[PDB]
mmCIF file of C-alpha atoms and ligand atoms in Angstrom:
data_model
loop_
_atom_site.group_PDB
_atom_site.id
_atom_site.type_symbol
_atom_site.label_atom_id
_atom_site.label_comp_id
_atom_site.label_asym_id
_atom_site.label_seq_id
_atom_site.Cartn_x
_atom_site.Cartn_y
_atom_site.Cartn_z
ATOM 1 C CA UNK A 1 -15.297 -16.614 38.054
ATOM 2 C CA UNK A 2 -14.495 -13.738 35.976
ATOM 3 C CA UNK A 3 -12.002 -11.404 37.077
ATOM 4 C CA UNK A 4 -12.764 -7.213 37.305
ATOM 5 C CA UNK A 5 -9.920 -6.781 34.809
ATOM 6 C CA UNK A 6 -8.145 -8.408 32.726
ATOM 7 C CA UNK A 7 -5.174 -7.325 30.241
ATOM 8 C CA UNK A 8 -4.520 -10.556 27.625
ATOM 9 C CA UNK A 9 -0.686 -8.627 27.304
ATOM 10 C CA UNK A 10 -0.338 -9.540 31.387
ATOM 11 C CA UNK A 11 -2.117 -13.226 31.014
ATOM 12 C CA UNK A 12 0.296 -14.124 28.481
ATOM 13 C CA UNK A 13 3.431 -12.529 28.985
ATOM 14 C CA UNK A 14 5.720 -13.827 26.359
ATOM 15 C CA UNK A 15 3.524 -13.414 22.943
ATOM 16 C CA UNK A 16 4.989 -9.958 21.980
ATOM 17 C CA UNK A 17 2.249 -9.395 19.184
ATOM 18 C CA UNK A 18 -0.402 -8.522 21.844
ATOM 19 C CA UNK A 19 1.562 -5.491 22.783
ATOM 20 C CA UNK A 20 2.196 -4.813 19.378
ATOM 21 C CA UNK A 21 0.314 -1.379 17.087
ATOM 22 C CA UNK A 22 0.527 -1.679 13.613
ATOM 23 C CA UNK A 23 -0.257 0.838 10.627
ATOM 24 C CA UNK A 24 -2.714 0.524 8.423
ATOM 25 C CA UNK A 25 -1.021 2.964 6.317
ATOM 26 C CA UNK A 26 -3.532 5.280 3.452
ATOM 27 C CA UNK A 27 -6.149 2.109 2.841
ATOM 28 C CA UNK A 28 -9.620 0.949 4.222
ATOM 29 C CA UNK A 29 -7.593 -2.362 5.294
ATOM 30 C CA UNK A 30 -9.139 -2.689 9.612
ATOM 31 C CA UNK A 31 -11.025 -5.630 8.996
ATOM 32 C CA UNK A 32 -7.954 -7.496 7.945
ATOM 33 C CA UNK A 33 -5.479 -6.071 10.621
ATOM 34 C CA UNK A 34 -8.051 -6.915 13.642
ATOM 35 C CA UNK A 35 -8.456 -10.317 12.087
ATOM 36 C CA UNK A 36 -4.358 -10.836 11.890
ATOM 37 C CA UNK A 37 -3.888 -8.848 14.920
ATOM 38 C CA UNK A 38 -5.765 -11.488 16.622
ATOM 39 C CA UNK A 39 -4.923 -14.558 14.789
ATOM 40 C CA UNK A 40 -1.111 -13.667 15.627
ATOM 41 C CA UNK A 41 -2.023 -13.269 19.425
ATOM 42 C CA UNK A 42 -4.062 -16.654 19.493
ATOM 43 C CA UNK A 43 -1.435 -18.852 17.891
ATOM 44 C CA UNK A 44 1.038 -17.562 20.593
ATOM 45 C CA UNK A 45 -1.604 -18.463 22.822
ATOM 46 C CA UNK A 46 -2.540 -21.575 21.522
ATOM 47 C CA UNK A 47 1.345 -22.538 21.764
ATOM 48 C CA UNK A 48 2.153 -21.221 24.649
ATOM 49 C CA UNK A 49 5.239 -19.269 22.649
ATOM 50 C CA UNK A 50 6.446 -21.986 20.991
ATOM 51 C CA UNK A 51 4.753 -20.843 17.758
ATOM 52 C CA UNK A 52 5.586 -16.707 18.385
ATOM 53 C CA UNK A 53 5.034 -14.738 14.353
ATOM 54 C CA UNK A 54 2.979 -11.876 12.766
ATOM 55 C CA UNK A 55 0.565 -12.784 10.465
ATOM 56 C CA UNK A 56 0.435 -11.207 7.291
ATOM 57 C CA UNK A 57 -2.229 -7.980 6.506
ATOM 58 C CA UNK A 58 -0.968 -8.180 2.989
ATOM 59 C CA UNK A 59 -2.042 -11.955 2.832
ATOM 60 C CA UNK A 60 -5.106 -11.584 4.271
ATOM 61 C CA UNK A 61 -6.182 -7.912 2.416
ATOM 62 C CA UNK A 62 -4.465 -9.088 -0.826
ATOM 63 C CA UNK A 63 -5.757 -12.915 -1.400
ATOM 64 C CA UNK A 64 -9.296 -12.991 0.356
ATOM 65 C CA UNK A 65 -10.872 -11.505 -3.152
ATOM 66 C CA UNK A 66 -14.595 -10.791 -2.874
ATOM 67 C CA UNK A 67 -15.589 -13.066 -0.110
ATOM 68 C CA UNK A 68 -14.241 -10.070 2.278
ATOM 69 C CA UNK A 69 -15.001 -7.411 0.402
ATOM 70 C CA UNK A 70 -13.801 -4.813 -1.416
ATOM 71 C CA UNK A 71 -9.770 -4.769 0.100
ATOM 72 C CA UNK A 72 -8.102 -1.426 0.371
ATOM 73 C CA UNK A 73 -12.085 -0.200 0.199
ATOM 74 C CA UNK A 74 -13.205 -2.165 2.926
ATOM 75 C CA UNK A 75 -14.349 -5.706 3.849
ATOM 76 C CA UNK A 76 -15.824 -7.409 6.806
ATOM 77 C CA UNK A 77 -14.314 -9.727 10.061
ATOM 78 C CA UNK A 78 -16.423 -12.663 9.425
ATOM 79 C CA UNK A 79 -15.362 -13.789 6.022
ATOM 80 C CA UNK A 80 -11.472 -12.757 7.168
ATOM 81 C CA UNK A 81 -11.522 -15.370 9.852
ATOM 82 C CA UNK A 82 -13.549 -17.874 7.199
ATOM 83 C CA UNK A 83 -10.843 -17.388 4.979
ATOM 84 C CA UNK A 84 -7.960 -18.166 7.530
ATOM 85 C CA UNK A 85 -10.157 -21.537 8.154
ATOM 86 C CA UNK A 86 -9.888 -22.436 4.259
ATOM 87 C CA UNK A 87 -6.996 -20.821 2.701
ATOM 88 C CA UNK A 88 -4.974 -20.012 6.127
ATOM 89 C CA UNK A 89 -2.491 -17.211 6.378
ATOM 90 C CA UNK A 90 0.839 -16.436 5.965
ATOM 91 C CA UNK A 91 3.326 -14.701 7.917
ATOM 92 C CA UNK A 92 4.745 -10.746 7.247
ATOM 93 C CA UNK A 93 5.366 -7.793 10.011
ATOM 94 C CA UNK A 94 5.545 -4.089 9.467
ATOM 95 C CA UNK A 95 6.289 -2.046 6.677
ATOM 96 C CA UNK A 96 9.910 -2.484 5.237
ATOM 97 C CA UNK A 97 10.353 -4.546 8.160
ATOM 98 C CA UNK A 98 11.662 -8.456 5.820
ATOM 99 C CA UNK A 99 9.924 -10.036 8.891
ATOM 100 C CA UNK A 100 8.510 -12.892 8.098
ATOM 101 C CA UNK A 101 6.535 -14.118 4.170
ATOM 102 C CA UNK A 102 4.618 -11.197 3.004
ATOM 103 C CA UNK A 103 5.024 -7.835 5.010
ATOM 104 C CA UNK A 104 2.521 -5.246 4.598
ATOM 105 C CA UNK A 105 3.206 -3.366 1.436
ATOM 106 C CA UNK A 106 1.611 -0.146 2.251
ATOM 107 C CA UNK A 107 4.280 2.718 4.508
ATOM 108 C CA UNK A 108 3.046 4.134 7.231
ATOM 109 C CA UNK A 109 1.114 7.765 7.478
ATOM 110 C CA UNK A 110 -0.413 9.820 10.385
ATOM 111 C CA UNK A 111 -4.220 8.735 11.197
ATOM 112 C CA UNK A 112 -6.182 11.990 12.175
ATOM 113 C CA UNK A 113 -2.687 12.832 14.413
ATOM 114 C CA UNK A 114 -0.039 15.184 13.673
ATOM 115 C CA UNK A 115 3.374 13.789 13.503
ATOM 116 C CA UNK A 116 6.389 12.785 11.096
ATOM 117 C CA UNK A 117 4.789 10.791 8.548
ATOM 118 C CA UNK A 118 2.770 11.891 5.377
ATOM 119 C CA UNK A 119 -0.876 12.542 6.361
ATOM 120 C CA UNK A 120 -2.980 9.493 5.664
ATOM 121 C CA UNK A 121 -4.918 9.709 2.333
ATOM 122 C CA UNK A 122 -8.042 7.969 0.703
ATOM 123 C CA UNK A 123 -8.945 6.562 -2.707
ATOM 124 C CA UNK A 124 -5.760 3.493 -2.059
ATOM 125 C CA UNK A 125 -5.379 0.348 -4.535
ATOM 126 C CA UNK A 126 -5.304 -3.070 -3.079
ATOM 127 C CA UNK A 127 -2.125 -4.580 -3.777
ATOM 128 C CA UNK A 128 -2.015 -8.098 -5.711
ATOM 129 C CA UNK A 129 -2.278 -11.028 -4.321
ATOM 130 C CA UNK A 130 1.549 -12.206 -4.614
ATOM 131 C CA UNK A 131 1.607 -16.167 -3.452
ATOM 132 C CA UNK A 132 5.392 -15.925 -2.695
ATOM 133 C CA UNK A 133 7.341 -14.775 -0.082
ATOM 134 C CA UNK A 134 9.914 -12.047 -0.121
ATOM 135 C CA UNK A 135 13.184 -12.883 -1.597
ATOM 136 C CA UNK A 136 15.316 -15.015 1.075
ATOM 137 C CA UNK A 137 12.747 -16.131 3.126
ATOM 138 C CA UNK A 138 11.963 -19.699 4.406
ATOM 139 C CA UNK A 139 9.995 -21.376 4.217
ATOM 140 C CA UNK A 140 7.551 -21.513 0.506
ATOM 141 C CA UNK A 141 4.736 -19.484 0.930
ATOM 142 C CA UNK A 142 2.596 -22.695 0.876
ATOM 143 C CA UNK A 143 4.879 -24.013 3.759
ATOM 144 C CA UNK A 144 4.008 -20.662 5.974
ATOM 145 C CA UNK A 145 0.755 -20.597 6.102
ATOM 146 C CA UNK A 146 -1.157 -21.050 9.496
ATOM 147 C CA UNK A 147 -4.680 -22.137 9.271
ATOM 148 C CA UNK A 148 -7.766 -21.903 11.658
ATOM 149 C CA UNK A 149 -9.813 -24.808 13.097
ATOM 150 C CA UNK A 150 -12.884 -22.611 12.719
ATOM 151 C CA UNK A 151 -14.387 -19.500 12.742
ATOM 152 C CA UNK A 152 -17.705 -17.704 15.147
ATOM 153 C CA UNK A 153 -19.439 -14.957 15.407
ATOM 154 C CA UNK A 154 -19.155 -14.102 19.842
ATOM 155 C CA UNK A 155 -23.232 -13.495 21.001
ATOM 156 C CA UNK A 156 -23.651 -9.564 21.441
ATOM 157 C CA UNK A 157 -23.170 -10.235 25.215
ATOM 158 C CA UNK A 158 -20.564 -8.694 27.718
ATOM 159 C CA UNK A 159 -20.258 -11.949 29.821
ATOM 160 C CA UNK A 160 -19.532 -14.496 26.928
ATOM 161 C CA UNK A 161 -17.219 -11.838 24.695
ATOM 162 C CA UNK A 162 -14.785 -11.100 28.217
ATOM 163 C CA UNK A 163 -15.209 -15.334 28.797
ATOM 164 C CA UNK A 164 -14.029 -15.746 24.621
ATOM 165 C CA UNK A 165 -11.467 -13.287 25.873
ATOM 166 C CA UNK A 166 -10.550 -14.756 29.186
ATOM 167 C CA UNK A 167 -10.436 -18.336 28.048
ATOM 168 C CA UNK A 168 -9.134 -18.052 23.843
ATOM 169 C CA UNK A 169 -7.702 -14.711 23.834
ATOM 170 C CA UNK A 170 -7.928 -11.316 21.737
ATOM 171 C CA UNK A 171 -11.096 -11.198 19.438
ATOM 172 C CA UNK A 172 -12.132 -8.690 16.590
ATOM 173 C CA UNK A 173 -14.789 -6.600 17.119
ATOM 174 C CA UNK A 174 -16.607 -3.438 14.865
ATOM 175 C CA UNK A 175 -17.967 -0.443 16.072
ATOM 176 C CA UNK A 176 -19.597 2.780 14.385
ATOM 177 C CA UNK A 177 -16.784 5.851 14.389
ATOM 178 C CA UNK A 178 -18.508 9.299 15.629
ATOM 179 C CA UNK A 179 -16.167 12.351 14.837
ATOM 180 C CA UNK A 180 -15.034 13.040 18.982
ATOM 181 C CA UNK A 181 -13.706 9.685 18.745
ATOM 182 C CA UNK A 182 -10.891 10.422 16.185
ATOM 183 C CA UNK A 183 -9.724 13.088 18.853
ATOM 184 C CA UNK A 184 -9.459 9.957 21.477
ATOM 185 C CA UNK A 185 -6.497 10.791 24.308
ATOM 186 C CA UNK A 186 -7.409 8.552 26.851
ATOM 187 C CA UNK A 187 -9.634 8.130 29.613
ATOM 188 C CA UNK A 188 -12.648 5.933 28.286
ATOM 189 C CA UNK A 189 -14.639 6.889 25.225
ATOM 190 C CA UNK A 190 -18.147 7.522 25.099
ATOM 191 C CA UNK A 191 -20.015 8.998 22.518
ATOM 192 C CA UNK A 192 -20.728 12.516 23.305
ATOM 193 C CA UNK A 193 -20.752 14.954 20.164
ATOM 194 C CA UNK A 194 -20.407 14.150 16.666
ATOM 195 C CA UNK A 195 -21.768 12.786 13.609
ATOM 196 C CA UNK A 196 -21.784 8.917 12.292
ATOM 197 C CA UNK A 197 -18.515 8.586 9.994
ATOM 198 C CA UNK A 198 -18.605 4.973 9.702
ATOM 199 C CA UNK A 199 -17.734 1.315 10.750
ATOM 200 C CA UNK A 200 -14.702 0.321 12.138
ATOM 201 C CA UNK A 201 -12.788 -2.782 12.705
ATOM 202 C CA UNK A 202 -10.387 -3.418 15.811
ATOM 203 C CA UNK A 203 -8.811 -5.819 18.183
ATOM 204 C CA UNK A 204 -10.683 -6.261 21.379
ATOM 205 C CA UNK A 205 -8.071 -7.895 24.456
ATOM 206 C CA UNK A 206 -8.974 -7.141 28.074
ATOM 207 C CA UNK A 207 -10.947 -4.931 30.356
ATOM 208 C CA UNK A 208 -11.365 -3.260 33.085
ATOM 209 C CA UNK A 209 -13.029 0.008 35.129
ATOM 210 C CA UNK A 210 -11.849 3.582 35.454
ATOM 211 C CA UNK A 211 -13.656 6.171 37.588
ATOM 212 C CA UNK A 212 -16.847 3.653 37.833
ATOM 213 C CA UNK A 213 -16.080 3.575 34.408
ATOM 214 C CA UNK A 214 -16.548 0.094 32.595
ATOM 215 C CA UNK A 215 -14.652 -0.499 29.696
ATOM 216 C CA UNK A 216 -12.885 -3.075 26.738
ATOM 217 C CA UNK A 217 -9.204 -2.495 25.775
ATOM 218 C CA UNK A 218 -8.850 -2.136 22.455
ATOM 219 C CA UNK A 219 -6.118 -2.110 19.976
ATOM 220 C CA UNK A 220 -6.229 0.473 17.227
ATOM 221 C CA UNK A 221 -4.384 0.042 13.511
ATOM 222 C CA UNK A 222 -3.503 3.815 13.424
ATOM 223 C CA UNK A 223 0.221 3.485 14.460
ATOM 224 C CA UNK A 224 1.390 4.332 18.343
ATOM 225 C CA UNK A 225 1.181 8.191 18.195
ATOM 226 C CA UNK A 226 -3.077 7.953 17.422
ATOM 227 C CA UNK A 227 -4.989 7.396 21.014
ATOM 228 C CA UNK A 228 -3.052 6.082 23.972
ATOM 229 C CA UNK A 229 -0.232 4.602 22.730
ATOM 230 C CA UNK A 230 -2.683 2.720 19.805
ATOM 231 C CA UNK A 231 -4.935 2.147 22.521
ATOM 232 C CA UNK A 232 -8.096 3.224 23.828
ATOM 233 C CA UNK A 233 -10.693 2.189 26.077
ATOM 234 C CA UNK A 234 -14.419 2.229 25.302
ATOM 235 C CA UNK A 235 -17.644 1.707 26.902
ATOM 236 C CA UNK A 236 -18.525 -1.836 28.075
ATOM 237 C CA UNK A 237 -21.822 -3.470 28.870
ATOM 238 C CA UNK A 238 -24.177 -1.095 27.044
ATOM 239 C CA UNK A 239 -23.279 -2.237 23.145
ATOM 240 C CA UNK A 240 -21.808 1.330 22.962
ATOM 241 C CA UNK A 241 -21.601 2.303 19.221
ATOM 242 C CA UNK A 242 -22.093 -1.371 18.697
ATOM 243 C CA UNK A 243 -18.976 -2.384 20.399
ATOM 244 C CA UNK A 244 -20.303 -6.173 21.408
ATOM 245 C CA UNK A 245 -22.306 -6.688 18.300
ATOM 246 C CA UNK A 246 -19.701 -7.648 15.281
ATOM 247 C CA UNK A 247 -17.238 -9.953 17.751
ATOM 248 C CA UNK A 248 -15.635 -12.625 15.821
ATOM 249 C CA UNK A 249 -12.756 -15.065 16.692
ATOM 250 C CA UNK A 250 -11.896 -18.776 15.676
ATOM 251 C CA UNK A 251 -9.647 -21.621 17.085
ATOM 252 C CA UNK A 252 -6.103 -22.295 15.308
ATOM 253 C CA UNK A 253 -4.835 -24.753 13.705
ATOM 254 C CA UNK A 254 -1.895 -26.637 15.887
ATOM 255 C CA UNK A 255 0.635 -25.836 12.656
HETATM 256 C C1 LIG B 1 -10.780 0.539 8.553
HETATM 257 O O1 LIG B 1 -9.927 0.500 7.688
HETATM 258 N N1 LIG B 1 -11.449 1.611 8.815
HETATM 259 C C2 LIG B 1 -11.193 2.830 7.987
HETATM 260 C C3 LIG B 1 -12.372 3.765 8.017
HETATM 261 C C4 LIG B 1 -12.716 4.311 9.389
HETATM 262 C C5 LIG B 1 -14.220 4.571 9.385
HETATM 263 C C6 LIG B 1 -14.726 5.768 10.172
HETATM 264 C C7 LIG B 1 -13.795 6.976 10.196
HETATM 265 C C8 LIG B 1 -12.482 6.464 10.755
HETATM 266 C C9 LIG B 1 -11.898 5.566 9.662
HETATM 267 C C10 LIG B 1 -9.910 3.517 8.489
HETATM 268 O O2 LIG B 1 -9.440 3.222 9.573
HETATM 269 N N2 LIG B 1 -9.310 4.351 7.665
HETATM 270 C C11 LIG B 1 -8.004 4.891 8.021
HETATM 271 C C12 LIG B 1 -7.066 4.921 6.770
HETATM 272 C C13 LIG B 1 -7.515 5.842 5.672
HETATM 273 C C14 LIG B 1 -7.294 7.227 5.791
HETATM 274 C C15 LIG B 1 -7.692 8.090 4.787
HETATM 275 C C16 LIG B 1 -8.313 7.579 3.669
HETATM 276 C C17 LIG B 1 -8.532 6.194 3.527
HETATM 277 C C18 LIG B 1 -8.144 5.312 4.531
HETATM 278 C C19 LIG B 1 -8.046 6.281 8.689
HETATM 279 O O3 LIG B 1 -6.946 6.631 9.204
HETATM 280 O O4 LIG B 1 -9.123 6.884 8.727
#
């Protein structure tokens, strides 16, 4: 039944927003960009392109309030996805982008990376939660918003998170940073030097093997130029760093 690879940008061709890196800019803000990352792909999905947007960070880091944490200083999947069940989400792309409602409000910065862009720095406010979309666009913000038939937490097992994967599309998962992996090229991680730096949100949307090498595609927030493009490639089948223990996902909403 289940493939030895599988790439959710190759299964569905025409929904742009899985091949798509965004930047979490100078703020604590994964857990809501895996969460929208995700949401974005599986309403393409669940449309098959006839419903093709990017839903908004700034919604989702802006308006969840305390049930996801703590914003720009960190929050969780679970209650992101929970919150696009009750209060849904609207749509926004990339900084100074006007694509779509509310586009993310923070500008891009270089994520443990040299490059053109002010280095990345800490200590971030959460915006406000604005409920209105930027000037020009239709339709309200009340009109936009795309809400999920429910949310799960995926069993901490390979099989069902690359079925989830397979049969729903892209997930969120967490994982615990170590310092070698902020140096990540390519190939496919392991730990191998390095002390704990924390937990870490992504977007989790194929697999695969290199060199006898299983592994889960994964999505970073840290703009193209961090990784392999945005990408990288960790350990699968052995909960590496926790990589199959914190998957969440949920059903949308036909709008
Ligand atoms: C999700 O937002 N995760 C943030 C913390 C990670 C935990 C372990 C170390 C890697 C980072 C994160 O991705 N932070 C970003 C943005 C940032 C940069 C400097 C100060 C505050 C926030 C990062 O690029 O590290």
């Amino acid at each position: 039944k289940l493939p030895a690879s599988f790439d959710a940008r190759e299964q569905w061709p025409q929904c742009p927003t899985i091949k798509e890196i965004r930047d979490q800019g100078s703020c604590g803000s994964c857990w809501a960009f895996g969460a929208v990352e995700a949401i974005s792909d599986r309403i393409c999905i669940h449309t098959n392109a006839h419903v093709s947007v990017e839903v908004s960070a700034e919604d989702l880091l802006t308006c969840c309030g305390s049930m996801c944490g703590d914003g720009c200083n960190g929050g969780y999947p679970a209650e992101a996805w929970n919150f696009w069940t009750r209060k849904g989400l609207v749509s926004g792309g990339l900084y100074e982008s006007h694509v779509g409602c509310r586009p993310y409000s923070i500008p891009p910065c270089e994520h443990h990376v040299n490059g053109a862009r002010p280095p990345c720095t800490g200590e971030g406010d959460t915006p406000k939660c604005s409920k209105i979309c930027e000037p020009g666009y239709s339709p309200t913000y009340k009109q936009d918003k795309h809400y999920g038939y429910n949310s799960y937490s995926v069993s901490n097992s390979e099989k069902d998170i690359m079925a989830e994967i397979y049969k729903n599309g892209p997930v969120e998962g967490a994982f615990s940073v170590y310092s070698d992996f902020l140096l990540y090229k390519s190939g496919v991680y392991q730990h191998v030097t390095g002390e704990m730096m924390g937990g870490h949100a992504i977007r989790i949307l194929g697999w695969g093997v290199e060199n006898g090498t299983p592994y889960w595609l994964v999505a970073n927030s840290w703009n193209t130029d961090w990784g392999d493009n945005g990408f990288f490639k960790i350990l699968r089948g052995q909960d590496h760093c926790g990589i199959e223990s914190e998957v969440v996902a949920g059903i949308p909403r036909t709008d």
